[PDB]
Amino acid sequence: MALSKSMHARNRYKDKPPDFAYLASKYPDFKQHVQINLNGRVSLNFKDPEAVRALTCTLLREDFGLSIDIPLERLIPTVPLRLNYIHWVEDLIGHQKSTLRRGIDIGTGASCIYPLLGATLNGWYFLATEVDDMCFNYAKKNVEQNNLSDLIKVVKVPQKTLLMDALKEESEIIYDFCMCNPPFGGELEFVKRIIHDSLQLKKRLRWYSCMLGKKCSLAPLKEELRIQGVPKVTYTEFCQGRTMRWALAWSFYD
């Protein structure tokens, strides 16, 4: 699969990109990090992480009613890039109408963006896992301060553990999906550990997914899934300016 403008059609920002002037009119904490470029237009220095944090936190408040607090020392998620994945997962699990859907977020991060977007947008239940202590605290706090503790269960999982170990203190039988952004041997090895877990869980999880940061990772994993004899394998490509991502999903369903 390949989408128009290499980003989801139901993405808010494909047709309506952030208007920095409008956001600086409404949000003064965002107005500081805004600068007037060599053309007279309201620009943002994307090479500065304080500016990006301001952008992410502002977008989540204006366009999603989510008030998050994130540290600069940990990965700042790009809201329109992460948003493509939510809609892609909506498509896989066949999101329409009013039947509860259960997800797993391997490495949820400081922002807990995938669960906060999912639960807000579609009312999805989430098991958000984090190995990092700081991220776990920031994520539990962000879910707590957005009254989504009923829908998102944030859990600190040990350093080595992955998907099977996350379903330890869990009693749910069928999970509609698992989404994940692996951290930066390497990436391939990580996703391969998910593949091996997916072979253990088979149909207990409807769709297993991944958001890859390196193109060189896609061809081996597609092959890895084939040699392990995985029935359904779908993969797409996303964008947000110069930053590219490769989404990869697989199912044991015929």
Author numbering: 1 to 96, 100 to 187, 222 to 291
Extract from the study:
METTL16 is the second m6A methyltransferase identified, and its known substrates include U6 snRNA and the human MAT2A mRNA that encodes for S-adenosylmethionine (SAM) synthetase (Pendleton et al., 2017). Here we describe the crystal structure of human METTL16 to reveal a methyltransferase domain furnished with an extra N-terminal module, which together form a deep-cut groove that is essential for RNA binding. Consistent with the SAM-dependent methyltransferase activity of METTL16, both structures reveal a Rossmann fold composed of a central seven-stranded β sheet (strands β3–β9) flanked by three α helices each (helices α4–α6 and α7–α9). In contrast, we show here that METTL16 is active as a monomer, and it contains a large deep-cut groove that can accommodate structured RNAs.
Two constructs (core, 1–291 aa; and ΔN, 40–291 aa) encompassing the methyltransferase domain (MTase) were expressed in E. coli and crystallized (Star Methods). First, and most striking, is the presence of an N-terminal module (1–78 aa) in the core structure that is appended to the α4 of the Rossmann fold and that consists of three helices (α1–α3) and two short β strands (β1 and β2). Indeed, when mapped onto the METTL16-core structure, these reveal a positively charged cluster (K5, R10, R12, K14, K16, and R41) that forms the entrance of a wide deep-cut groove. Taken together, our two structures reveal an architecture where the MTase domain is attached to a METTL16-specific N-terminal module that is essential for activity.
